[PDB]
Amino acid sequence: GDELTRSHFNALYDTLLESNLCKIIEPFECVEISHISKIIGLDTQQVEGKLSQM
Amino acid sequence: ENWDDVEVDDDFTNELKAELDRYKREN
Amino acid sequence: NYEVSEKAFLLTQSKVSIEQRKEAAEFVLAKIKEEEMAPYYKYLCEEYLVNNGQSDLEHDEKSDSLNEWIKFDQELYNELCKKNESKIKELNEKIQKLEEDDEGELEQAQAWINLGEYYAQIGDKDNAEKTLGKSLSKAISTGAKIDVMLTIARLGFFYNDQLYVKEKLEAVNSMIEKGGDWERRNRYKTYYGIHCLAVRNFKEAAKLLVDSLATFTSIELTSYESIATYASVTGLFTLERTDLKSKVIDSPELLSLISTTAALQSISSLTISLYASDYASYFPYLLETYANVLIPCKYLNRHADFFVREMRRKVYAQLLESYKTLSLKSMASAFGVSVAFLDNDLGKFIPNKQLNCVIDRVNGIVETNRPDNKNAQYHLLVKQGDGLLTKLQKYGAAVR
Amino acid sequence: EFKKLDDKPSLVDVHLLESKVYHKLRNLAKSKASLTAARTAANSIYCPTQTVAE
Description:
This is part of a larger assembly, with two copies of chain A, one copy of chain B and one copy of chain C.
Chain A: H1 3-25, H2 33-40, H3 44-53
Chain B: H1 15-18, H2 20-26
Chain C: H1 2-8, H2 19-34, H3 38-47, H4 74-101, H5 106-122, H6 125-136, H7 142-157, H8 164-175, H9 182-199, H10 203-210, H11 224-238, H12 241-248, H13 254-260, H14 269-275, H15 282-294, H16 308-321, H17 339-347, E1 357-358, E2 367-368, H18 380-394
Helix pairs in contact in C: 1-2, 4-5, 5-6, 5-7, 6-7, 7-8, 8-9, 9-10, 10-11
PDB class: hydrolase
Entry title: Yeast proteasome in translocation competent state (C3-a)
Chains A, D: 26S proteasome regulatory subunit RPN6
C-alpha cells in the first residue's frame, strides 16, 4: 500500500540478490544456468532477467 | 552515408507491424 | 503564429481520423479573423498536394479536401483590406508625423518595431523587415535587438524556412552578445536545434535541446507543450542508454512534462521497457509514439521512418550486450514479431556496419559479436593513418 | 500574494503541501527548495506541533 516502501522493496530485492549473485561469481564462471537458479532459488527466467539488467 | 538517406526501405511502415499485435494472442 | 501552423499541419497527412483535421480547423478559423493568415493560408495548398492541396478558389480552382474551411470567401477578401488600412495605414501616418516633427530617437525606433508586429498580423514579411531595418541602426540594447530576431524567428515557424532564419540568428548574437535569461538564450539555442531536424544532423540537433530548460514558452513563436515534445522525444533518439538513466528517465523537469500532458507517452513507456528489459510490450509503444506524437508534430515529420527504425536497431543492441548468444523462440516469437519480419529487421542492420552479431538457422542461435582485443586499435587506428595522410599532403603538394 | 500580504505563518502550510506535490512528481529540485523555504521561515513564523514535526 505504500509507494515509498515498495520503492525500497525492490532496492532490497536487488540488494539481497546481489549478495546471492556474488556467491556464484566468487568461484570460476562458465557453469550451467540450470544450476544457477537452484543456488539462488528463483526461476530461470527470473534470474536471467534481473542479472542481465545489472 | 551508405544505404541510408534516399534509398530508405519502402517497408516496415504500417501493415507489417499491424499484424504483429495479433501474433501475441495466437501463441 | 505557430499555433496556426501547428494545427493546420494536420491538414497535410492524416492516416487515422479526419476529426483530427476538423478539430484543428477550429483554431485556423478562429485565429484568421484576429490576424490575417493569408500568406500561410494560401501556402496550405501550395505546400503539399494530393491531399488538401487541390482545393483553392483563388490560384487554381479545384476541390479535393477532407476539410472545406480552407477555401476563400467574400469575408476574408474584405477583411484583407480592412486589416491593411487599420493596422498599418492608420498607424503609419502617426509615425510619419513623428519623423516630420523630430521627436526623440529611440522612441521613433520602437515605433517601427511596434508597427512591424502588425505586418506579421497581416502576414507581410517584406515590410516587416523593412520597418526593423530603419530601427536596426538605432538599436543599442537587447530591447531592440531581440525584437528583430522575433520576426526572423517567425520566418521559420510561420513561413517554414530552415535556411534564412538560422543564418540571421548567428549574426545578431555576434553583434551584441549578452543572453539575458535562459529563454533569451534558448532562442539562440533551442531554435538552432529545430532547424537541424530538417537537414537531419542527428546529435547536432539534440546538443542544445537537452541542456534547454522545460519552462521555455514563446507563445506566438512556440508553446509550452511544443518545446516539451521536441526536447523530450528528440533526446531519446540521441542519448544512448548510459545517458538515458541520469537524464531522461530521471529529471526534475522532463518528468513534469509527461505528467502534466499525458499525450506524450515517450520518455515513460519507452524508457521503462528498456530499463526493465521487457521488449514484448515495448514494440506497441512505438506506434503510439509514432502516430500520436511524431506524425502530428511539425518538425518531427522530416525524418519519418528514421525514428522507429533507429530504435528497432538499438532495442536488440541492448540485448546483445547482456548475453553472448540468443535464442530464436525468445526473439522471433516471444517478442511479438515473426521469423520473416525479424530477419528483415536485422537483415539490413549488419551490412550498414552499425552493429555486429551472428544469426543461425538450424540451431536458431543469435550470437553477439564482440570486439575483444580489437576495439579502436584495429580499424580506427589503421583508418587514422590514411585519414591524416590525405589532409596532410593536400596543402603541401601545392606549395605556394 | 502569500508573502507577507495576508498571513505570515500560512507559508509553511502551503510549502508543506507544495513539497508533497513535487514528491509524487519525482522532482527533487523544487521539493528540497519548498521545504528549505519552510524550514528557514521556522525561525521567523511559527507552526503547531503537527506541522513542525511533519
